[PDB]
């Protein structure tokens, strides 16, 4: 990398928790365009991820690397040390690609195995209007939910469970709790604090 | 590309759904100035487009490529593999140009075949004034409507269908529902919540 | 050009309609500093201008080029094809300069032949104060009025025609309708909604 | 120059009228660091200055150049054409320096000979507080007043002449009209709309 | 010089402030006609300007000479004494001209850097008619104000600022506290002590 | 330097008066990383500092250079001209370092000898709350107070002398005038306009 | 380094006190990507850290270096001078790495030995709502708390000790003082000023 | 030195704080006249300043010496002992001068880094006239305050801050809590115990 | 050394503060018996007392080392490394002796540098008898004072200063506030809460 | 020189302001007796008086040096260095004489350049007797006036201007406001508060 590019990656990523679609998109573009080694990837992780979530990433990545080594990974000679060191070798292109892929995949479980994430704590304000609440909760889900998620059902349920205390009654009153998101958007259009 | 240029393209595009005039302008400038291959275009798509809309882009692009191959596309030898791989070849300039053109054209159907887009959900606020609503809805249409659209009739209709609940009566009261946009702009100038 | 420079030109120009002094200044600086060919100018136009106003620019530019070719333009051999192609030739510096000049001059008629522009739709708010309205309307005129305009008379008239509904009476009440802009600025200083 | 540097100069200068200390500082740094010719200076003027104030700059610069040529200017041979062309010659360093100095000095009279400038139209709002008014008027003077000005007396007088309609009485009531600026700042601290 | 010429210069200048346009005209004419060296200029400065103003002008001239020698006078070598010593040499004519120019330019910064100038302290007399007061203000400002600084806005502000308190009240009643100079001249005509 | 770096230095410095810790930090980094000559330092000063404070900087720097020359400064041969010119010589590295150090030290007295600075004019608003006032006054002191200052006592005194008119009584009422800053922060937590 | 990169590091770090996770992440990335010497590290410290906290950093770093030298540090020959000078040597890569590590570790004690930090002075506003207070206090802790901290207990306690004066009673009233942070977040959701 | 010279230095300095302008004047004169080595300077520091102030000055001097040796003294080689040892060598005169300069500069940072200084703790006596109190404040501040720091604003703040409570009330009634020093001197003249 | 020896030493110093007479006795005996090197002394320092006190002792040891090195040491060769490194030599026993003496003497000024000391902050409980509090104060003095400090007057003052409020009233009524300590013990013998 | 000589000189000037007749006498005697060089004179200047007055004296000395150098000096060789350097020569004794005369003459204009002078700001106390105030004013005049200033008329004016309000009323009732000073002394002989 270069320091400016790393700072740009951080600034683009800063609003997204590890494993989010925006996080993964930016990190995948970084890995593709810069082709980093294991040392560069470690520096990138330590600069982006906090100590706790970097440790969590390593806890998943070690399991992934153990899976790959036990099951056989192309170009890796076990006598030549571990995969982390063999990635740093400049003549091992394929092993470098495989280690980058494992590094990226280790980020998938960080939000998938996270406990009580921030997007679950998005409670609608006592006087915050529901139309802005939908957009705020969509933004929160886009920055804290893992890749491959079935986002729309969870959005549908969170539109009620985390709704305003009066909206909790209002949604049942108009009979739109189990309807799609647009139905509740139409239902709560008339609400005001 | 370079990572900085890709990030700039994303930041310019971020407010526009795939296929919008701003989206298409920025992506066309990127393709012209950088002359990307199929791999670079795939990286650009995955970095910009979400997984769902990237999959939709591929679903349209495969149909476009099948049309081109069945109908005959210049410089493409079927024995040399598929068009995606032949684009990556550095000596195939014309095939690269044709694949870039097909890639750009595959974006036209993403908003054209999208279901219930965000610009349709632009409901005027209960106390939001109509003069600002016109500008907001124009901005929404400029970021979610496909290229080649007959925008002005749709703007004219959405000025009433999505208007304020009181404006829904007010526009009929002054008799300007079927008039051009400027007539409703003059009509609703006196409205206040 | 380069993609970053084109994006900078767009961001500087984005608030100005084609043909405005700011638009023309930025585009003239771009043409001078980058010395673009016909292909580069076409890419610049398509990236900046929307499809409708790019088509309008071409409609004026074809007339300008026909005028130049019929009247005789230096360095252009008609047997060598059209002016657009001859501009792209790297050894034709003078023809390139002339085509760039024609391209820039084709932008003069886009606001000069536009119908009912946005700056005419600048109606003063029902409670918007007149002192801020003057600055807003000046900014609007600076971004939608063509080069070589007699701006000050039009500003003077628009200060009344588009004024606040109460200001429409107030300006006549103090007897400053036909006076210069400063006289109305002094006259409406005491107004409040 | 380069297009990015010119755009940066414009963005730094955009809030200052020609001839202001900020304007002159940025333009002097540009001239020193880039060492422009007459053509580059003309492009810079046309890109920054509007048509009217560029014409005013030329009206003063022609007089300055006539003064220099009539009085004798080092390195200039009259048989070699005018000073503008001789500046563009790459082997005439000293004449280039002298023409740049004349170009910079031609900017001094643009605010010095301007009629009824914007900083004179800074009337205090009917409910705008005086403490913020002092800072606003200082900022206005810093962006519209020529170099070498005796700014503080003019600030002292404008603190009363352009003051709030009630402040026009209040300042005389506390007897601080002719006192320094700090005395009026202390005097109007207690005022409220 | 000669004694008679210096005395005539002082009598022409005596009514004018140091750095004033009246001062600068006569002093520039004397410099042009007599071609004075550093010693002659120092004598003239001591004869015209007081010791304190002489010290301020020497400070300005030292700053200007330091800047010029840092940037490079055409013929000034860093040898054979400073620029003041080399100005006395008859052979080094160009150095003499450059010193004359810097010495003249040093005066122009005195009015712009003078603290609490006397031209702003001239107030309207209690029984003095407003016409006489504005004539006195014009006389003071057409001299005391620096070279080329806009004077008319300074009249339009200070004629109200420096007006008599009863005259200020009359201006307030007339509503011409910020009207042009002619309007304030007309408004205050009816005043009588 | 380069124009972009100079503009960045200005934008970082723009909020800090000469001699402030932020000012000195940025200028010291500039001098270290760019290693400027006397001409470059003069251009930097003229571009950053206004004419008055640049003249003040020169007034202090001439005294500093006179001290260094009279007391003996390493590598400086008096026969080789002055220190300003000898700094510009590309083979005099040590003299260049010494002149840069003197230039930086000349900035220390600009706020240390300034009269009635802006941070002294930070009067608490009539309804501005004290908790925000503490932060505002801390920011003001960080941008207008010289290096090596005993900031905390002055902050402690200014928390009362410049406090709100009601806070002037409130602080004495709770008996925390002479206590540290945290004690007044606790004391005024309950205040409200 | 380069001046632009140093300014970027400052702008990213500016909101974090020395030793904070964000501070340490940015500085570690800088050290890794730029590989600075002792002189470069000293310039970086003086440009980022204020004089007081730079002196504190040196007070800790001297102790760390004394520990390393007394206990034996690889590649350091005591006869070759001190570690600071030996780091600047371009052929001593390992000693440079060790000095950079010691420099980074000297930052750990700056917040760990700081007295009464700013994050402790985060008192909830008298009418500031608790939901925003939690986020504000989390941000404050993220910018003023040292690395390796047990942040969550301190957050839990500060949610009550620094809570609103009414919230100090409210939290005990609902019986959630000793419960985790989410329990108080649920408890104070209904509070309003 | 000599014993008599050291005693005279102490008697001249005894009334002055460490780091004070009175302290610095005498100490710089002693350094200039006696040309002291490291041992002589250490003896003088032990004789004048107490053990605690000696430790603080040694901390400052260690920081300054570390910084200078990292950046490079003219004659200091990383050999033959540290800079303090090489200062005692009669041959290395330049090292002695550099050590003297750094040792002198170490004092100047003590008043700027001193916590809870005594000059700010001098309060107005209950029956002490305000003239005597302001004289005492001037005596304390003209010594205790560091070198070159602005003193007059500190008087204008602390003379009200450190005034007697009845005198503070008198200042409040006079409305001169932020008036210049002369205005507060005039206002408090009528006070009597 | 051995681990058991250090453990016994720490058990001996478990109550004694750094600098306490018990602490100094056991540490002096350890240094005499085991003749530790500089590395051994640093390990013992890091094991006995916490990080803050270890850092303060490092500052004291650095001050003493600098002073002794400047003055002169028994077998010091500054060319052959610093004191902390030279003490780690089987040959340089005499310098190790002086380093051990300096290491112990650094503890002498450690309790005197303590802020808010606890060896004089022992307070009597509400129901605590006077003689028990006096005994605890005496024990804390013998266990927390710096070496050589006269304990009798401190005990005499603290027998009343730190006594219980009931004991304070008893002493004040008897007029025995400044009596000999035996008189405090006799007078309070008949009192018990 | 010697340290004791400078200490005695400063004790002599302890009360005398820069430019006072006592100050000038003792400084002239010092210059005559010790025949100081330019470096010695600078050291004496820096030791006698503070930084601000030293800077003003440097400005005066620079003005005098420039004037004399332009006019001509006894043994001045401008090729052979400036005056401040040439005076530091065992050979150029005659130029050192002129530099000493200039150094003393720079003090002559120093008290005259003082702003808000204290030598004429001595005020009588409320209960202070008239003759004691007159004596103190006379002493302050003899100790603060510039050299050669007529003290008799100043004393005559200040005997009434600075007199106590009771003394002012006594003089006004007697009509002795502009009487000879002996008449003030005789008329106020019978009055005492």
PDB file of C-alpha atoms in Angstrom, chain E:
ATOM      1  CA  UNK E   1      18.421  69.442  -5.211  1.00  0.00           C
ATOM      2  CA  UNK E   2      18.756  73.060  -4.273  1.00  0.00           C
ATOM      3  CA  UNK E   3      17.575  74.855  -1.151  1.00  0.00           C
ATOM      4  CA  UNK E   4      14.870  76.737  -3.061  1.00  0.00           C
ATOM      5  CA  UNK E   5      13.591  73.547  -4.698  1.00  0.00           C
ATOM      6  CA  UNK E   6      13.385  71.762  -1.338  1.00  0.00           C
ATOM      7  CA  UNK E   7      11.567  74.712   0.230  1.00  0.00           C
ATOM      8  CA  UNK E   8       9.092  74.811  -2.664  1.00  0.00           C
ATOM      9  CA  UNK E   9       8.517  71.062  -2.319  1.00  0.00           C
ATOM     10  CA  UNK E  10       7.804  71.493   1.392  1.00  0.00           C
ATOM     11  CA  UNK E  11       5.412  74.411   0.845  1.00  0.00           C
ATOM     12  CA  UNK E  12       3.530  72.384  -1.768  1.00  0.00           C
ATOM     13  CA  UNK E  13       3.541  69.362   0.558  1.00  0.00           C
ATOM     14  CA  UNK E  14       2.984  71.123   3.910  1.00  0.00           C
ATOM     15  CA  UNK E  15      -0.814  70.909   3.683  1.00  0.00           C
ATOM     16  CA  UNK E  16      -0.556  67.193   2.810  1.00  0.00           C
ATOM     17  CA  UNK E  17      -0.045  64.213   5.099  1.00  0.00           C
ATOM     18  CA  UNK E  18       2.933  61.873   4.642  1.00  0.00           C
ATOM     19  CA  UNK E  19       2.057  59.158   2.163  1.00  0.00           C
ATOM     20  CA  UNK E  20      -0.829  61.233   0.801  1.00  0.00           C
ATOM     21  CA  UNK E  21      -1.544  61.499  -2.939  1.00  0.00           C
ATOM     22  CA  UNK E  22      -0.621  65.190  -2.777  1.00  0.00           C
ATOM     23  CA  UNK E  23       2.595  64.228  -0.970  1.00  0.00           C
ATOM     24  CA  UNK E  24       3.337  61.399  -3.395  1.00  0.00           C
ATOM     25  CA  UNK E  25       2.758  63.500  -6.521  1.00  0.00           C
ATOM     26  CA  UNK E  26       5.240  66.196  -5.501  1.00  0.00           C
ATOM     27  CA  UNK E  27       7.782  63.728  -4.126  1.00  0.00           C
ATOM     28  CA  UNK E  28       7.675  61.541  -7.242  1.00  0.00           C
ATOM     29  CA  UNK E  29       8.087  64.645  -9.399  1.00  0.00           C
ATOM     30  CA  UNK E  30      11.100  65.708  -7.327  1.00  0.00           C
ATOM     31  CA  UNK E  31      12.637  62.235  -7.593  1.00  0.00           C
ATOM     32  CA  UNK E  32      12.084  62.164 -11.358  1.00  0.00           C
ATOM     33  CA  UNK E  33      13.437  65.660 -12.014  1.00  0.00           C
ATOM     34  CA  UNK E  34      16.417  65.780  -9.659  1.00  0.00           C
ATOM     35  CA  UNK E  35      17.578  62.128  -9.833  1.00  0.00           C
ATOM     36  CA  UNK E  36      18.553  62.057  -6.145  1.00  0.00           C
ATOM     37  CA  UNK E  37      20.972  59.672  -4.495  1.00  0.00           C
ATOM     38  CA  UNK E  38      20.571  58.071  -1.069  1.00  0.00           C
ATOM     39  CA  UNK E  39      22.090  61.073   0.729  1.00  0.00           C
ATOM     40  CA  UNK E  40      19.835  63.558  -1.068  1.00  0.00           C
ATOM     41  CA  UNK E  41      16.755  61.427  -0.394  1.00  0.00           C
ATOM     42  CA  UNK E  42      17.690  61.091   3.279  1.00  0.00           C
ATOM     43  CA  UNK E  43      18.115  64.875   3.500  1.00  0.00           C
ATOM     44  CA  UNK E  44      14.742  65.437   1.831  1.00  0.00           C
ATOM     45  CA  UNK E  45      13.063  62.973   4.201  1.00  0.00           C
ATOM     46  CA  UNK E  46      14.555  64.716   7.236  1.00  0.00           C
ATOM     47  CA  UNK E  47      13.500  68.107   5.872  1.00  0.00           C
ATOM     48  CA  UNK E  48       9.886  67.208   5.093  1.00  0.00           C
ATOM     49  CA  UNK E  49       8.839  64.495   7.532  1.00  0.00           C
ATOM     50  CA  UNK E  50       9.250  64.730  11.292  1.00  0.00           C
ATOM     51  CA  UNK E  51      11.620  62.480  13.229  1.00  0.00           C
ATOM     52  CA  UNK E  52       8.897  59.974  14.127  1.00  0.00           C
ATOM     53  CA  UNK E  53       7.583  59.773  10.560  1.00  0.00           C
ATOM     54  CA  UNK E  54      11.198  59.569   9.398  1.00  0.00           C
ATOM     55  CA  UNK E  55      11.680  56.528  11.643  1.00  0.00           C
ATOM     56  CA  UNK E  56       8.493  54.885  10.350  1.00  0.00           C
ATOM     57  CA  UNK E  57       9.540  55.495   6.747  1.00  0.00           C
ATOM     58  CA  UNK E  58      13.002  54.114   7.498  1.00  0.00           C
ATOM     59  CA  UNK E  59      11.384  50.993   8.944  1.00  0.00           C
ATOM     60  CA  UNK E  60       9.285  50.590   5.799  1.00  0.00           C
ATOM     61  CA  UNK E  61      12.293  51.233   3.552  1.00  0.00           C
ATOM     62  CA  UNK E  62      14.416  48.728   5.477  1.00  0.00           C
ATOM     63  CA  UNK E  63      11.710  46.099   5.025  1.00  0.00           C
ATOM     64  CA  UNK E  64      11.400  46.890   1.314  1.00  0.00           C
ATOM     65  CA  UNK E  65      15.177  46.856   0.771  1.00  0.00           C
ATOM     66  CA  UNK E  66      15.528  43.555   2.630  1.00  0.00           C
ATOM     67  CA  UNK E  67      12.763  42.006   0.525  1.00  0.00           C
ATOM     68  CA  UNK E  68      14.205  43.355  -2.736  1.00  0.00           C
ATOM     69  CA  UNK E  69      17.737  42.181  -1.947  1.00  0.00           C
ATOM     70  CA  UNK E  70      16.384  38.764  -0.963  1.00  0.00           C
ATOM     71  CA  UNK E  71      14.550  38.563  -4.295  1.00  0.00           C
ATOM     72  CA  UNK E  72      17.288  40.343  -6.238  1.00  0.00           C
ATOM     73  CA  UNK E  73      17.776  43.828  -7.632  1.00  0.00           C
ATOM     74  CA  UNK E  74      18.991  43.802 -11.238  1.00  0.00           C
ATOM     75  CA  UNK E  75      22.437  45.224 -10.461  1.00  0.00           C
ATOM     76  CA  UNK E  76      22.796  44.851  -6.679  1.00  0.00           C
ATOM     77  CA  UNK E  77      25.641  42.554  -5.788  1.00  0.00           C
ATOM     78  CA  UNK E  78      26.099  41.448  -2.156  1.00  0.00           C
ATOM     79  CA  UNK E  79      29.296  43.484  -1.922  1.00  0.00           C
ATOM     80  CA  UNK E  80      30.750  47.004  -1.823  1.00  0.00           C
ATOM     81  CA  UNK E  81      28.342  47.996   0.924  1.00  0.00           C
ATOM     82  CA  UNK E  82      24.558  47.843   1.204  1.00  0.00           C
ATOM     83  CA  UNK E  83      22.124  49.208  -1.351  1.00  0.00           C
ATOM     84  CA  UNK E  84      22.149  52.651   0.293  1.00  0.00           C
ATOM     85  CA  UNK E  85      25.933  52.904  -0.088  1.00  0.00           C
ATOM     86  CA  UNK E  86      25.822  51.675  -3.685  1.00  0.00           C
ATOM     87  CA  UNK E  87      23.104  54.222  -4.483  1.00  0.00           C
ATOM     88  CA  UNK E  88      25.502  57.107  -3.797  1.00  0.00           C
ATOM     89  CA  UNK E  89      27.850  55.763  -6.486  1.00  0.00           C
ATOM     90  CA  UNK E  90      27.325  57.760  -9.711  1.00  0.00           C
ATOM     91  CA  UNK E  91      28.176  54.744 -11.882  1.00  0.00           C
ATOM     92  CA  UNK E  92      25.468  52.468 -10.427  1.00  0.00           C
ATOM     93  CA  UNK E  93      22.548  54.337 -11.939  1.00  0.00           C
ATOM     94  CA  UNK E  94      20.190  51.355 -11.929  1.00  0.00           C
ATOM     95  CA  UNK E  95      20.760  50.838  -8.212  1.00  0.00           C
ATOM     96  CA  UNK E  96      19.950  54.520  -7.672  1.00  0.00           C
ATOM     97  CA  UNK E  97      16.674  54.171  -9.597  1.00  0.00           C
ATOM     98  CA  UNK E  98      15.733  51.018  -7.686  1.00  0.00           C
ATOM     99  CA  UNK E  99      16.494  52.703  -4.365  1.00  0.00           C
ATOM    100  CA  UNK E 100      14.425  55.699  -5.440  1.00  0.00           C
ATOM    101  CA  UNK E 101      11.493  53.442  -6.324  1.00  0.00           C
ATOM    102  CA  UNK E 102      11.677  51.515  -3.042  1.00  0.00           C
ATOM    103  CA  UNK E 103      12.077  54.756  -1.076  1.00  0.00           C
ATOM    104  CA  UNK E 104       8.993  56.202  -2.779  1.00  0.00           C
ATOM    105  CA  UNK E 105       7.001  53.010  -2.188  1.00  0.00           C
ATOM    106  CA  UNK E 106       7.959  53.091   1.498  1.00  0.00           C
ATOM    107  CA  UNK E 107       5.917  56.277   1.966  1.00  0.00           C
ATOM    108  CA  UNK E 108       2.748  54.729   0.532  1.00  0.00           C
ATOM    109  CA  UNK E 109       2.574  52.197   3.379  1.00  0.00           C
ATOM    110  CA  UNK E 110       2.614  54.866   6.108  1.00  0.00           C
ATOM    111  CA  UNK E 111      -1.040  55.975   5.645  1.00  0.00           C
ATOM    112  CA  UNK E 112      -2.108  52.330   5.397  1.00  0.00           C
ATOM    113  CA  UNK E 113      -0.229  51.470   8.598  1.00  0.00           C
ATOM    114  CA  UNK E 114      -0.781  54.713  10.527  1.00  0.00           C
ATOM    115  CA  UNK E 115      -2.705  54.252  13.773  1.00  0.00           C
ATOM    116  CA  UNK E 116      -5.506  56.679  14.681  1.00  0.00           C
ATOM    117  CA  UNK E 117      -5.207  58.990  11.656  1.00  0.00           C
ATOM    118  CA  UNK E 118      -6.244  62.621  11.935  1.00  0.00           C
ATOM    119  CA  UNK E 119      -8.417  62.629   8.798  1.00  0.00           C
ATOM    120  CA  UNK E 120     -10.949  60.427  10.606  1.00  0.00           C
ATOM    121  CA  UNK E 121     -10.978  62.711  13.669  1.00  0.00           C
ATOM    122  CA  UNK E 122     -12.395  65.726  11.793  1.00  0.00           C
ATOM    123  CA  UNK E 123     -15.979  65.976  13.054  1.00  0.00           C
ATOM    124  CA  UNK E 124     -18.905  68.175  12.102  1.00  0.00           C
ATOM    125  CA  UNK E 125     -19.121  71.430  14.009  1.00  0.00           C
ATOM    126  CA  UNK E 126     -22.149  72.052  16.192  1.00  0.00           C
ATOM    127  CA  UNK E 127     -23.232  75.082  14.140  1.00  0.00           C
ATOM    128  CA  UNK E 128     -21.276  74.083  11.030  1.00  0.00           C
ATOM    129  CA  UNK E 129     -23.578  73.470   8.042  1.00  0.00           C
ATOM    130  CA  UNK E 130     -23.507  69.952   6.643  1.00  0.00           C
ATOM    131  CA  UNK E 131     -22.206  71.317   3.334  1.00  0.00           C
ATOM    132  CA  UNK E 132     -19.173  72.834   5.062  1.00  0.00           C
ATOM    133  CA  UNK E 133     -18.632  69.622   7.033  1.00  0.00           C
ATOM    134  CA  UNK E 134     -18.760  67.460   3.905  1.00  0.00           C
ATOM    135  CA  UNK E 135     -16.378  69.874   2.163  1.00  0.00           C
ATOM    136  CA  UNK E 136     -13.946  69.547   5.076  1.00  0.00           C
ATOM    137  CA  UNK E 137     -14.299  65.758   4.984  1.00  0.00           C
ATOM    138  CA  UNK E 138     -13.605  65.718   1.241  1.00  0.00           C
ATOM    139  CA  UNK E 139     -10.540  67.927   1.728  1.00  0.00           C
ATOM    140  CA  UNK E 140      -9.196  65.705   4.514  1.00  0.00           C
ATOM    141  CA  UNK E 141      -9.935  62.400   2.763  1.00  0.00           C
ATOM    142  CA  UNK E 142      -8.681  63.441  -0.681  1.00  0.00           C
ATOM    143  CA  UNK E 143      -5.315  63.980   1.036  1.00  0.00           C
ATOM    144  CA  UNK E 144      -5.092  61.865   4.190  1.00  0.00           C
ATOM    145  CA  UNK E 145      -6.364  58.661   2.607  1.00  0.00           C
ATOM    146  CA  UNK E 146      -3.663  56.500   0.951  1.00  0.00           C
ATOM    147  CA  UNK E 147      -3.031  56.324  -2.776  1.00  0.00           C
ATOM    148  CA  UNK E 148      -5.835  54.746  -4.782  1.00  0.00           C
ATOM    149  CA  UNK E 149      -7.997  53.625  -1.866  1.00  0.00           C
ATOM    150  CA  UNK E 150     -11.752  54.056  -2.506  1.00  0.00           C
ATOM    151  CA  UNK E 151     -12.804  57.378  -1.011  1.00  0.00           C
ATOM    152  CA  UNK E 152     -16.505  57.728  -1.879  1.00  0.00           C
ATOM    153  CA  UNK E 153     -17.739  54.897   0.410  1.00  0.00           C
ATOM    154  CA  UNK E 154     -15.599  56.410   3.160  1.00  0.00           C
ATOM    155  CA  UNK E 155     -17.458  59.701   2.738  1.00  0.00           C
ATOM    156  CA  UNK E 156     -20.823  57.928   2.638  1.00  0.00           C
ATOM    157  CA  UNK E 157     -19.978  56.301   5.974  1.00  0.00           C
ATOM    158  CA  UNK E 158     -18.041  59.003   7.839  1.00  0.00           C
ATOM    159  CA  UNK E 159     -20.317  61.913   6.884  1.00  0.00           C
ATOM    160  CA  UNK E 160     -22.955  60.244   9.037  1.00  0.00           C
ATOM    161  CA  UNK E 161     -20.436  58.858  11.533  1.00  0.00           C
ATOM    162  CA  UNK E 162     -18.729  62.238  12.033  1.00  0.00           C
ATOM    163  CA  UNK E 163     -21.919  64.297  11.750  1.00  0.00           C
ATOM    164  CA  UNK E 164     -23.274  66.328  14.640  1.00  0.00           C
ATOM    165  CA  UNK E 165     -25.561  64.415  16.990  1.00  0.00           C
ATOM    166  CA  UNK E 166     -28.554  66.541  16.009  1.00  0.00           C
ATOM    167  CA  UNK E 167     -27.517  66.138  12.369  1.00  0.00           C
ATOM    168  CA  UNK E 168     -27.243  62.386  12.964  1.00  0.00           C
ATOM    169  CA  UNK E 169     -30.779  62.425  14.373  1.00  0.00           C
ATOM    170  CA  UNK E 170     -31.941  64.352  11.300  1.00  0.00           C
ATOM    171  CA  UNK E 171     -30.319  61.717   9.083  1.00  0.00           C
ATOM    172  CA  UNK E 172     -32.083  59.008  11.099  1.00  0.00           C
ATOM    173  CA  UNK E 173     -35.438  60.754  10.660  1.00  0.00           C
ATOM    174  CA  UNK E 174     -34.758  61.194   6.938  1.00  0.00           C
ATOM    175  CA  UNK E 175     -33.896  57.492   6.755  1.00  0.00           C
ATOM    176  CA  UNK E 176     -30.725  58.324   4.809  1.00  0.00           C
ATOM    177  CA  UNK E 177     -28.151  56.817   7.171  1.00  0.00           C
ATOM    178  CA  UNK E 178     -26.914  54.597   4.309  1.00  0.00           C
ATOM    179  CA  UNK E 179     -28.147  56.625   1.328  1.00  0.00           C
ATOM    180  CA  UNK E 180     -25.677  57.885  -1.302  1.00  0.00           C
ATOM    181  CA  UNK E 181     -23.688  61.048  -0.671  1.00  0.00           C
ATOM    182  CA  UNK E 182     -26.002  63.231  -2.751  1.00  0.00           C
ATOM    183  CA  UNK E 183     -29.053  61.972  -0.869  1.00  0.00           C
ATOM    184  CA  UNK E 184     -27.475  62.836   2.486  1.00  0.00           C
ATOM    185  CA  UNK E 185     -26.439  66.228   1.091  1.00  0.00           C
ATOM    186  CA  UNK E 186     -30.050  66.914   0.099  1.00  0.00           C
ATOM    187  CA  UNK E 187     -31.473  65.586   3.377  1.00  0.00           C
ATOM    188  CA  UNK E 188     -29.278  67.735   5.641  1.00  0.00           C
ATOM    189  CA  UNK E 189     -29.797  70.967   3.679  1.00  0.00           C
ATOM    190  CA  UNK E 190     -32.797  72.001   5.797  1.00  0.00           C
ATOM    191  CA  UNK E 191     -30.773  71.744   9.022  1.00  0.00           C
ATOM    192  CA  UNK E 192     -29.998  75.001  10.822  1.00  0.00           C
ATOM    193  CA  UNK E 193     -28.223  75.623  14.168  1.00  0.00           C
TER     194      UNK E 193
END
